[PDB]
From a paper:
Fucoidanases (EC 3.2.1.–) catalyze the hydrolysis of glycosidic bonds between fucose residues in fucoidans. Fucoidans are a compositionally and structurally diverse class of fucose-containing sulfated polysaccharides that are primarily found in brown seaweeds. Here, the structural characterization of a novel endo-α(1,4)-fucoidanase, Mef1, from the marine bacterium Muricauda eckloniae is presented, showing sequence similarity to members of glycoside hydrolase family 107. Using carbohydrate polyacrylamide gel electrophoresis and nuclear magnetic resonance analyses, it is shown that the fucoidanase Mef1 catalyzes the cleavage of α(1,4)-linkages between fucose residues sulfated on C2 in the structure [-3)-α-l-Fucp2S-(1,4)-α-l-Fucp2S-(1-] n in fucoidan from Fucus evanescens.
By crystal structure determination of Mef1 at 1.8 Å resolution, a single-domain organization comprising a (β/α)8-barrel domain was determined. The amino acids in the groove are largely positively charged, as is especially evident for Arg35, and are likely to assist with the binding and positioning of the largely negatively charged sulfated fucoidan polysaccharide. CAPSO, which is normally used as a buffer, is a small, sulfated molecule and the sulfate group of CAPSO 1 is coordinated in the Mef1 crystal primarily through Arg35, while the EG site is close to a small α-helical structure stabilized by Ca1.
Residue numbers in the entry: 25 to 394
Write the structure that this text describes.
């Protein structure tokens, strides 16, 4: 379990399903994986894909011991037999490079009742399957489909990051139970529902009256005046091993480099890990987008090297983990981001590591309550 504590990581997006088939002719994810290994020796872990980013009906593997997905469900759910080797080769390079591998799953699956883009044809094909073979029990159908791939990733995936969990077929706990039944040693994070041991509301920082804090301004030249709440990652739900780390949503106007994360979110979990008790606690982990969008290289890059270095240092010094939300082009990390990752890595290899520039509240940055 402990490998995640103090680890920093990057994302290598691998597409799934028919989208992987379409992207394979002009992309090389093997190069992208080798690129990470060769340039980022200090990186401890890499996030990549069991499903396509944010889409539960596109998988990175094809063959499945419990279902011929192409013949029984829909051919676009799986890549070609040749292209299913992409994710396997990626994992081999990362493992051979000494990296741990966390696999992303959009758990709302083909019915797409959460963040997966709705696709009527995909949903109908899926319903035809689970009604014919599972007599209407979508939850068991979905767990069984996924089980086949969890089985194939045994020893390859070191963890799983579950998204869209409010739309999962059946009970999320049954789905997590299924994973642990296949491989009880993998680390599991869930983007909601089972992280907060105390409640099913999202956890925000609060004042003495129990009201949520709100950022008013990010600084004198804040480009977006929308106020936003500040997520806490101090979450110890029993079903998960590490915190999902999803910060306040970008679409609400919360920048991923928010000063409030340096002042509230990160110090809280650094302090939590200072008392880490594996019997009681998750490994505290942050997944911070590099840009104002998670996966679009055209979105504004929100980190320079000095702030990215402080983010990684602050969290990993304290035994937390951090993952970057990197973007990919043609199967390799976007250059402008790799340049930053490389400079972070360079500094982390120095002995002593150089001090980071101290966090100071930006000019004009303030809470509503100030
Ligand atoms: O980074 S991923 O896409 O794999 C998972 C999640 O963090 C992204 N959520 C956004 C929400 C806004 C619209 C598109 C998806
Ligand atoms: O993904 S779904 O819409 O199906 C599940 C939905 O309950 C999750 N969003 C809540 C509300 C906003 C703060 C975070 C938690
Ligand atoms: O987190 S809570 O549900 O307590 C309140 C907060 O989420 C509402 N934010 C919306 C979201 C996107 C449009 C602008 C405002
Ligand atoms: Ca949807
Ligand atoms: Ca703002």
């Amino acid at each position: 379990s402990k490998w995640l504590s103090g680890s920093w990581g990057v994302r290598l997006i691998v597409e799934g399903g028919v989208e992987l088939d379409k992207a394979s002719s002009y992309s090389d994810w093997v190069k992208g994986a080798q690129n990470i290994v060769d340039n980022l020796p200090t990186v401890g872990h890499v996030f990549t894909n069991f499903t396509h980013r944010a889409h539960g009906y596109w998988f990175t593997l094809r063959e499945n011991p419990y279902v011929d997905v192409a013949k029984e469900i829909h051919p676009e759910f799986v890549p070609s037999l040749e292209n299913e080797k992409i994710i396997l080769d990626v994992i081999d390079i990362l493992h051979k490079g000494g990296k741990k591998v966390i696999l992303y799953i959009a758990t709302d699956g083909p019915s797409a009742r959460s963040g997966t883009r709705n696709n009527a044809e995909y949903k109908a094909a899926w319903e035809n399957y689970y009604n014919a073979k599972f007599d209407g029990d979508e939850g068991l159908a979905y767990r069984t489909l996924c089980k086949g791939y969890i089985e194939r990733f045994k020893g390859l995936a070191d963890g799983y990051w579950l998204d869209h969990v409010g739309g999962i077929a059946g009970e999320l706990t049954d789905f997590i139970d299924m994973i642990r039944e296949v491989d009880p040693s993998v680390m599991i994070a869930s983007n909601g529902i089972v992280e907060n041991e105390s409640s099913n509301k999202s956890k925000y920082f609060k004042d003495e009256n129990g009201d949520d804090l709100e950022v008013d301004s990010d600084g004198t030249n804040d480009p977006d005046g929308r106020k936003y709440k500040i997520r806490s990652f101090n979450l110890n739900g029993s079903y998960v091993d590490f915190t999902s780390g999803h910060p306040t949503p970008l679409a609400w106007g919360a920048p991923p480099n928010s000063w409030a994360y340096e002042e509230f979110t990160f110090p809280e979990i650094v302090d939590a890990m200072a008392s880490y008790d594996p019997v009681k606690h998750t490994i505290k982990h942050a997944w911070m987008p590099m840009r104002m969008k998670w996966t679009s290289p055209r979105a504004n890059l929100m980190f320079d090297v000095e702030q990215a270095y402080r983010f990684v240092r602050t969290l990993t010094d304290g035994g937390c983990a951090i993952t970057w939300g990197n973007t990919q082009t043609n199967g390799s990390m976007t250059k402008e981001e790799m340049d930053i990752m490389k400079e972070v890595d360079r500094r982390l290899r120095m002995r002593p590591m150089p001090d980071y520039i101290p966090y100071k509240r930006p000019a004009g940055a303030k809470l509503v309550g100030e």
